[PDB]
Amino acid sequence: QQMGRGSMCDAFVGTWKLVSSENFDDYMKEVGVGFATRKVAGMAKPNMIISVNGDVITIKSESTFKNTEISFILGQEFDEVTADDRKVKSTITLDGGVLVHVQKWDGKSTTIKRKREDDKLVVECVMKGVTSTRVYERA
Numbered sequence: 001q002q003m004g005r006g007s008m009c010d011a012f013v014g015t016w017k018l019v020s021s022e023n024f025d026d027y028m029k030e031v032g033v034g035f036a037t038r039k040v041a042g043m044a045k046p047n048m049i050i051s052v053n054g055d056v057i058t059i060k061s062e063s064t065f066k067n068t069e070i071s072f073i074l075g076q077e078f079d080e081v082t083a084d085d086r087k088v089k090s091t092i093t094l095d096g097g098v099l100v101h102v103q104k105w106d107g108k109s110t111t112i113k114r115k116r117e118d119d120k121l122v123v124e125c126v127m128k129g130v131t132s133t134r135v136y137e138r139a
């Protein structure tokens, strides 16, 4: 019943809009996303809402492709069904200033890193040798 303190993660909180994407189709291909899903997913310019309440972080994506929402505690594995409909086991940790999100499914793994750079939030999606960089701006 008191007002809690802030945290470093507060740099991520807010409302973000996708402004650029690079190599996302190739990332999705490497992940195993099929043709029609890649085409539709690649058009979307989501709004991402990041919030924190105590130890719980929520990342919501409001998207013309597929809305998603995850809530989690750093270091604590959870179930996630991804925008492309994978059922994955995810763990998100804060490593320095970078949120590191590892998704595991069917013996595969991909990592999504989120970092503040100037006024942007940069999202770096890595499947094996293939990286996609997605830049969000404040909405």
Ligand SMILES: COc1ccc(CCC(=O)O)cc1C
Pocket (backbone or CB within 6 Å): 027, 028, 031, 033, 041, 061, 082, 083, 084, 123, 125, 134
């Ligand atoms: C493999 O497919 C994927 C993977 C990651 C995302 C989220 C990318 C972002 O938050 O900007 C979205 C999709 C469709």
